[PDB]
Structure 1
Amino acid sequence: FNVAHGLAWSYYIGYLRLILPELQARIRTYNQHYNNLLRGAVSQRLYILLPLDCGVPDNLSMADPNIRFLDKLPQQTVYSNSIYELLENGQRAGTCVLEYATPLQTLFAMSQYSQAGFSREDRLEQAKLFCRTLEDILADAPESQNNCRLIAYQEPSSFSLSQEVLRHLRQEEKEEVTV
């Protein structure tokens, strides 16, 4: 009995499969303004944060204060999407469309619902499974694996999410320019 299968498939079929196609161009559009104005460009990929503690806060800033909301992204000329700037020592070091995964929140709710019989150990196993399954789905999906990137991580002590995101953005740019 694995709720993570359905959660992954439903996140893809109901949300990613629909929103991603518009994206790769919507960001291309925005970067006209962004490049001309702030002398920086937004990464093309949609970054999906997958905290394995299934802890999705209301806003990204609360979890890490170096992730800072920048600007809402427009639609192609019913979905809101937020550009966040990543920070280092107060300086802008990257920008990206970055959002938490709703399925993970369901797993947290389940672990606080006693009639589920769903322990924290169960919750973590199912979070990992959600990650692996969504990976498999995007692997066989067209231009979608290319339009979005998954960032799974386990908090220990103190941890830096802005840094883990910047790792990925810098890797993405490395790829863009090399190949």
Structure 2
Amino acid sequence: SVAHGLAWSYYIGYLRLILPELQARIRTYNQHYNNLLRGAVSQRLYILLPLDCGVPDNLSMADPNIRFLDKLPQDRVYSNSIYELLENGQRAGTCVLEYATPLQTLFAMSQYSQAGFSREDRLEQAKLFCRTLEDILADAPESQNNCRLIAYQEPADDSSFSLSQEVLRHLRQEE
């Protein structure tokens, strides 16, 4: 199962490096980067995990209610982005949000003939990736409390699905 290595390297090579400093980066941003009406950025890295492995280049193109706000300021450099979440036209939250990049590997594999990797195989591995990553984070209490995995399967009636709503459900659980 490719998901095992994908989850482990995502943790070892990214999450365990970025998460320990995230709380401070967000606090600093909230306290030091002045824009009159900007809302407080929520703590935690919110990670989108579509089980279909469909990762857009433009996160806001997946949902007009997810609006880019700013880059989270920074020994290496990590690009993280802050977004406002809208609900019925109003600002309902502000958070640090991104797709789980290893899902792009699963998607690319499914499009690569020689991989012998079907859409069915991909869905199995996407589920396994989420499970494996959850188990890793459960054993790392610090990293666990600094991120939230948002795993979802999209309904056939896409008019009944809102990516912003999915993020808001998780964000509001912390409140």
TM-score where L is the length of structure 2: 0.92
State the Cα deviation string for residues 130-158 of structure 1 (Å, max 9, x = none): 00000000000131100001000011154
Give the 4+ runs in structure 1 shifted more than 6 A.
none
In structure 2, relative to structure 1, the CA distance for the partners of 1:163 and 1:60 (3 Å cut) is same
Shift of 1:80: 1.1
Shift of 1:40: 2.6
In structure 2, relative to structure 1, the CA distance for the partners of 1:145 and 1:82 (3 Å cut) is same
- Is the CA contact 1:71–1:83 (under 8 Å) kept in the aligned structure 2? yes
Could you list the runs of 5+ residues in structure 1 that have no partner in the other structure? 172-179
State the Cα deviation string for residues 114-135 of structure 1 (Å, max 9, x = none): 1111110000000000000000
- Is the CA contact 1:56–1:100 (under 8 Å) kept in the aligned structure 2? yes
State the Cα deviation string for residues 67-109 of structure 1 (Å, max 9, x = none): 0101111019911110000001221110100000111000000
More divergent stretch after superposition (29-38 vs 85-94): 29-38
Percent identity between the aligned chains?
A: 98
State the Cα deviation string for residues 13-69 of structure 1 (Å, max 9, x = none): 000001111101100111124687326311111000000110000011111110010
SS class of match (1:98): strand
SS class of match (2:160): coil
TM-score where L is the length of structure 1: 0.90
Could you list the runs of 5+ residues in structure 2 that have no partner in the other structure? none
- Is the CA contact 1:72–1:81 (under 8 Å) kept in the aligned structure 2? yes
- Is the CA contact 1:34–1:41 (under 8 Å) kept in the aligned structure 2? no
In structure 2, relative to structure 1, the CA distance for the partners of 1:76 and 1:163 (3 Å cut) is farther
Correspondence for 2:163 among 127, 145, 161: 161
In structure 2, relative to structure 1, the CA distance for the partners of 1:36 and 1:145 (3 Å cut) is same
Pairs aligned (count):
170
Write the distance in 2 (CA, Å) between the matches of 1:93 and 1:101. Answer: 23
